[PDB]
Amino acid sequence: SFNVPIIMDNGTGYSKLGYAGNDAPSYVFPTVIATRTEDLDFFIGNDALKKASAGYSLDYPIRHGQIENWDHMERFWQQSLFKYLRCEPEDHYFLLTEPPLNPPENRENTAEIMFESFNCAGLYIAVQAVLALAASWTSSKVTDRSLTGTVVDSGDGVTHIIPVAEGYVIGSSIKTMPLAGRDVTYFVQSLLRLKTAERIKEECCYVCPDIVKEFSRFDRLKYASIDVGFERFLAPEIFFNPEIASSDFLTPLPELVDNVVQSSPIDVRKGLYKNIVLSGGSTLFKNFGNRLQRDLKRIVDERGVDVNVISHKRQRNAVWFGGSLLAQTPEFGSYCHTKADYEEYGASIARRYQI
Amino acid sequence: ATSQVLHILPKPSYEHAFNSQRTEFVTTTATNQVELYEQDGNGWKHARTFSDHDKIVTCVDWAPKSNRIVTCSQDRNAYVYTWKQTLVLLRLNRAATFVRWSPNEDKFAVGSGARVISVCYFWWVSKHLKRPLRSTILSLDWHPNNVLLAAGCADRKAYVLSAYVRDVDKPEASVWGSRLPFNTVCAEYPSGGWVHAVGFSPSGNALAYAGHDSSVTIAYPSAPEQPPRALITVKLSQLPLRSLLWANESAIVAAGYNYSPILLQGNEAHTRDLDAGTSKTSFTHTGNTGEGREESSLPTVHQNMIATLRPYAGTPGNITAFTSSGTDGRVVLWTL
Amino acid sequence: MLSLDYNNIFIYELLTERFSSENQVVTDFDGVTFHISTPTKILISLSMKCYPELVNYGTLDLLKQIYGAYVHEPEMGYNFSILIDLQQLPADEEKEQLAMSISMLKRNVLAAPFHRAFTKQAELAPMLDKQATSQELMAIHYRDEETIVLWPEHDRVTVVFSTKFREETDRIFGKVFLQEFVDARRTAPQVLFSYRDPPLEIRDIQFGFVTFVLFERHFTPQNREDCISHIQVFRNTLHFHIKASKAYMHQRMRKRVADFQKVLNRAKPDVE
Amino acid sequence: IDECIGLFRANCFFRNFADRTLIYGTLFISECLERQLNFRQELAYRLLSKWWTCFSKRRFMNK
Amino acid sequence: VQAAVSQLIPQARSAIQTGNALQGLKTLLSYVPYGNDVQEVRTQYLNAFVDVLSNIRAADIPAFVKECSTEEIDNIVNFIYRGLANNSSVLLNWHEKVVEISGIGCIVRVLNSR
Amino acid sequence: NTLRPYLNAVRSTLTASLALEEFSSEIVERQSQPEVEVGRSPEILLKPLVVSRNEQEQCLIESSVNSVRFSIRIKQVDEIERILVRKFMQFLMGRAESFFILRRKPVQGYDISFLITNYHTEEMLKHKLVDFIIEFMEEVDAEISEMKLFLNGRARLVAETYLSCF
Numbered sequence A: 001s002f003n004v005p006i007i008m009d010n011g012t013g014y015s016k017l018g019y020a021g022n023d024a025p026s027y028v029f030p031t032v033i034a035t036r037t038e039d040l041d042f043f044i045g046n047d048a049l050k051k052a053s054a055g056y057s058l059d060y061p062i063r064h065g066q067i068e069n070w071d072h073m074e075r076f077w078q079q080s081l082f083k084y085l086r087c088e089p090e091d092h093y094f095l096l097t098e099p100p101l102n103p104p105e106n107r108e109n110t111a112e113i114m115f116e117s118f119n120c121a122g123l124y125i126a127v128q129a130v131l132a133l134a135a136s137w138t139s140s141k142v143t144d145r146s147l148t149g150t151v152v153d154s155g156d157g158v159t160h161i162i163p164v165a166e167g168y169v170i171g172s173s174i175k176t177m178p179l180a181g182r183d184v185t186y187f188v189q190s191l192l193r194l195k196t197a198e199r200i201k202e203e204c205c206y207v208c209p210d211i212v213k214e215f216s217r218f219d220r221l222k223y224a225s226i227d228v229g230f231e232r233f234l235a236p237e238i239f240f241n242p243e244i245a246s247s248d249f250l251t252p253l254p255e256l257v258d259n260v261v262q263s264s265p266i267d268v269r270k271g272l273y274k275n276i277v278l279s280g281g282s283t284l285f286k287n288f289g290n291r292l293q294r295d296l297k298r299i300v301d302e303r304g305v306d307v308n309v310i311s312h313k314r315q316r317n318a319v320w321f322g323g324s325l326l327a328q329t330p331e332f333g334s335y336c337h338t339k340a341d342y343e344e345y346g347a348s349i350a351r352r353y354q355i
Numbered sequence B: 001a002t003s004q005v006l007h008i009l010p011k012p013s014y015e016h017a018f019n020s021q022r023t024e025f026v027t028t029t030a031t032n033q034v035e036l037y038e039q040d041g042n043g044w045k046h047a048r049t050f051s052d053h054d055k056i057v058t059c060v061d062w063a064p065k066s067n068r069i070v071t072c073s074q075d076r077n078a079y080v081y082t083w084k085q086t087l088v089l090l091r092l093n094r095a096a097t098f099v100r101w102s103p104n105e106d107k108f109a110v111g112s113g114a115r116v117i118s119v120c121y122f123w124w125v126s127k128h129l130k131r132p133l134r135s136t137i138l139s140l141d142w143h144p145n146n147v148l149l150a151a152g153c154a155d156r157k158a159y160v161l162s163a164y165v166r167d168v169d170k171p172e173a174s175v176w177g178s179r180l181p182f183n184t185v186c187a188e189y190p191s192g193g194w195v196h197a198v199g200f201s202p203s204g205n206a207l208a209y210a211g212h213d214s215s216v217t218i219a220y221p222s223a224p225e226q227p228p229r230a231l232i233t234v235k236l237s238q239l240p241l242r243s244l245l246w247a248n249e250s251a252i253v254a255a256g257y258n259y260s261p262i263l264l265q266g267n268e269a270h271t272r273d274l275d276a277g278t279s280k281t282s283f284t285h286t287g288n289t290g291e292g293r294e295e296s297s298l299p300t301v302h303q304n305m306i307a308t309l310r311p312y313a314g315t316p317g318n319i320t321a322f323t324s325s326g327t328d329g330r331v332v333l334w335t336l
Numbered sequence C: 001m002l003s004l005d006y007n008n009i010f011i012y013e014l015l016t017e018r019f020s021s022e023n024q025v026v027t028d029f030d031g032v033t034f035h036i037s038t039p040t041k042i043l044i045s046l047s048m049k050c051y052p053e054l055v056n057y058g059t060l061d062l063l064k065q066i067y068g069a070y071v072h073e074p075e076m077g078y079n080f081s082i083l084i085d086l087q088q089l090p091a092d093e094e095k096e097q098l099a100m101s102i103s104m105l106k107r108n109v110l111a112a113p114f115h116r117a118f119t120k121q122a123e124l125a126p127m128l129d130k131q132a133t134s135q136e137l138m139a140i141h142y143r144d145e146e147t148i149v150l151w152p153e154h155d156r157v158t159v160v161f162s163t164k165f166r167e168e169t170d171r172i173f174g175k176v177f178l179q180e181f182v183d184a185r186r187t188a189p190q191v192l193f194s195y196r197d198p199p200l201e202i203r204d205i206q207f208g209f210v211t212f213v214l215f216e217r218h219f220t221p222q223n224r225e226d227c228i229s230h231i232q233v234f235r236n237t238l239h240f241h242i243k244a245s246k247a248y249m250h251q252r253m254r255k256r257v258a259d260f261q262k263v264l265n266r267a268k269p270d271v272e
Numbered sequence D: 001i002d003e004c005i006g007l008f009r010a011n012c013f014f015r016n017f018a019d020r021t022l023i024y025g026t027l028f029i030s031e032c033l034e035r036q037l038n039f040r041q042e043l044a045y046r047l048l049s050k051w052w053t054c055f056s057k058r059r060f061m062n063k
Numbered sequence E: 001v002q003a004a005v006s007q008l009i010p011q012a013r014s015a016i017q018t019g020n021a022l023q024g025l026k027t028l029l030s031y032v033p034y035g036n037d038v039q040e041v042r043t044q045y046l047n048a049f050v051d052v053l054s055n056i057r058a059a060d061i062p063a064f065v066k067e068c069s070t071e072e073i074d075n076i077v078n079f080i081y082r083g084l085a086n087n088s089s090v091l092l093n094w095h096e097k098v099v100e101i102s103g104i105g106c107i108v109r110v111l112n113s114r
Numbered sequence F: 001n002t003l004r005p006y007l008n009a010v011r012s013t014l015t016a017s018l019a020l021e022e023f024s025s026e027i028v029e030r031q032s033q034p035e036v037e038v039g040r041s042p043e044i045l046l047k048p049l050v051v052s053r054n055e056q057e058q059c060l061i062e063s064s065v066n067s068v069r070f071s072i073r074i075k076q077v078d079e080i081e082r083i084l085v086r087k088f089m090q091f092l093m094g095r096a097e098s099f100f101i102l103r104r105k106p107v108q109g110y111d112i113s114f115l116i117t118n119y120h121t122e123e124m125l126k127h128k129l130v131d132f133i134i135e136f137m138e139e140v141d142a143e144i145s146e147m148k149l150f151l152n153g154r155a156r157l158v159a160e161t162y163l164s165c166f
């Protein structure tokens, strides 16, 4: 029975959950679980964060991107399906998200839970990076479905650059940058001499063409919240100049993408440059799209080949939206696995997945 | 009576083999490798490791005077031996299981699944003793005349036959026969359940075998193609033993799926074992004092199965010390 | 999660905060769908497959009472709609009462049959209540193959739940729960189940059959409203706890292989 | 001249660099934090002509 | 037929009725029916063997098995194991004694016997 | 009451019936498979034993030179218990790659089966593995008991809760 399939993206800190066909996730809260007839006693997400008084036994079930808390994460999916989403799991197909290079073992368990204990009619275990490309198909400057490109996800952890070739991840190349939303929120605090400035980051900042230039433009300064200035363009600069704050990192985001691309098989290299997608809240910055392209065009041309980066309206929750955009379309049911299949062909039938 | 652990080897070792003066020994890493160890300090250390081979190495033997070693494997062939090696193509089509040299290192026999013992004259020749054998040959031993070969297979039968080449030693008048060319059956002498180990006496005119029956059998032949003078089987009350050797013509050592070696003593059951219980009192430092020390698991030197017992030291036809290879890795010098 | 929630938490949480600062289809249990829309001033729509079945029992009325003013022409593809205007919302504690009320949308559309059955089990005041067990028997077809039938008598309001067990494990587990329902000593509502064959009130276009017998006390004016927002959630409270139990076995089983796999990996020898 | 003084409000964050006029000059812009400067004079008697009080804790080239 | 084992069973059956049951075991524990096709002969034998063991007082077991021959032990264990299949748990208690006092080898030999 | 002499006879058997050498075939080109699973060489197979306790519980032991096939028939008395095992057993078997001594499917008319190769009675110690199988037989019965006194536990707590709200 194929009705509105449930979309759930479980994150390293925050879990995005809702229904397909919808514009945006219905809930987004912290992927937490507070513990202490003693398994029914708990509370997930926002509940737990409030119940930290009586027994703050909260333990985030996802470490680094993968589930490392099994029986907590089961207890998390339980309450997320009956408390928040309110959906008899036996009536819906389910689309879930995994990080690049998530070991088949972790898929084989996610299956065991959704089926042999919740009875989910159908299940799908889409790789996150690819869902982010799926979300790029929404905006104007594309008009061509292709699951081949480079995903730049930047949340509040690490900034990932992930190459995707014909549906699958070229994992050998997935290079990261140790700077994200936390780090600009932090750097804009040091310039303000903490949520007191995280707002400042979100509603004043923008990526600019050149620091040396825009600082002279400033001599002709939005003041609210109290005096905001230099930080507006200086803060989001760190992605393109790591040494403004973190003197450990050296290679900037533009050059770092190039590496990823140049360090992949030559026959895919043409496509990865042509389809660069932006993902996560910290790529939401104004002109973050351009100063990634413009800087990369001048970095690639120094070695006639083109390059392109797509900045779409629904960037911040691309994983989820990409899931929704994918799971809504006709052929979806086909690529899922039915609970009644998991029983006829074993768990081995739920180790892989199509596109 | 006194048991000293020489080294506890990393992987399960199925057949120890020491050199002439017992300063070097080889084992089996139950894989394509064969280990070689030299004496460093009080213990032992790694030396060579012989990689050449495809499948899993079975039995190994070290020739005393020649110093050359031979490694048969589930490769269907053997190898003769910093070290230069010679690949010996044994014609048999089913995995080789057992290999022992020759009292004078003249030739060597090789057990197999192909119901054939490969004997090797010397470009290396390989004459195939292939007749009254039915099952996979689990063990073999040479008569002190490099002609008569005892072999015990998995068809509950222990066979004694001739393996005389034209470039071998004829043997004299023996209790086994007079006319013994090649594939000459001297003994059907059998009854057990897989003859795990065969063994001629030091005097040569007697043959003892042990089976998975948890039995040992000293058997004295009578005459060429006649009856048997007396065939004495002894049934034990312990997990069956898989390797024996004659301490003398009147007492035989054997160990196996037990852990300890038992001591049988034939003539016409149990002279002892090998424990660390009884240790009463002496009269050396003071008066009423003196046990023994020099510092939850089975209370034995070994802790898995025994593999083989090979002689280590002794006089003319008498044995004073033997070594034990273990599935647990332990390699022990038992100074009887 | 010990007892299920009666209202749609989304709608509630969605609204309670949309009743704050400045200026999308949801699922619910039992094949229900909700549509919180904005064609500024929010819309909201319910759609039960069985809805028009409940129109006869007086749902279309009870609703025009609760959401009186907020009622609007039902959205195309849906059965019933309210429309809260976020600029002309209620006065300050009542603002967070409309919330629950609107989030109770499903509770309410499915509570008319019960009300107009507690009313007959009062009007019935020398013992032909048989012409009621026959004549005045309401039946909801809320799920796919599962239904609720209820019927008043002079002293009781028997409510019967039909339930299908999708599996072969939930069935056995079901019996273990249901049996413990049928036995309650040292009071309250009495339960009565007989999984094989239904009570002699069949022929209602209708596997397991659970019968609650709501006695006079369990729907007094002082509490009758809670009784409904409770009795109607039975199947789900049962099937949920079967799934919870179905999972505590999982914990108490994955823990067990780890034991064995630790005892096996300890059985391997060492360097020592 | 007018280069490193305009570059100052940005270059001073970075920590790695005929160049020596900027290196041994943009640092002199920082050490220059009523005229009390007493040809280095010019590279300061111009910087004189509040959003420059912040860069006081930004050591150019970390030196 | 060569089922004169059918003349060995009546002795043991009576040796139960009288009192001295162990005497009957010492009787039927000689010349047992080797593996065949005709199990119907062996079944009636086994039936007797387990009936015998069922009424031998526990205190008398260690004394019998200690006196018993190694052929007899290997044989008695051999029937115990064939007895465990459908006969009581008394068999299991015999197995405990005839192993602890006559070694593990008995089972090893039972593992062979064709 | 009779759970002690039963496991005794099982251990005493296994200790003997689980003493295996490395054995290469006489059929397949230089191979080595559990000779008890093929059974195509009577020379190498031993005599199979079963160890009962009652009509309910028992276990058979099929032994060969290089391998043994141990199969258990677990205590089931009703409905709830009959499934409670059939899902513990149906679970364990779905983990037979990590639980290397299990059979993918058990022997016909038995609940679970172990395939112990000579490869196992070398990787771990002769007895440490015997001692384990006994501990397994003890613990499964133990869990099935605990899982039962915890579905009955919840049933009460659930049915009592729902009823009290009225």
Ligand SMILES: Nc1ncnc2c1ncn2[C@@H]1O[C@H](COP(=O)(O)OP(=O)(O)OP(=O)(O)O)[C@@H](O)[C@H]1O
Binding pocket: A011, A012, A013, A014, A154, A155, A156, A157, A181, A182, A185, A198, A201, A202, A203, A205, A280, A281, A282, A284, A285, A316
């Ligand atoms: N419009 C915006 N401009 C600049 N920064 C933003 C904007 N929106 C959100 N951010 C920043 O993005 C950071 C993380 O937001 P995001 O939604 O990417 O988290 P996330 O996707 O949950 O991360 P993860 O998936 O790694 O858990 C926050 O620190 C936030 O300040």
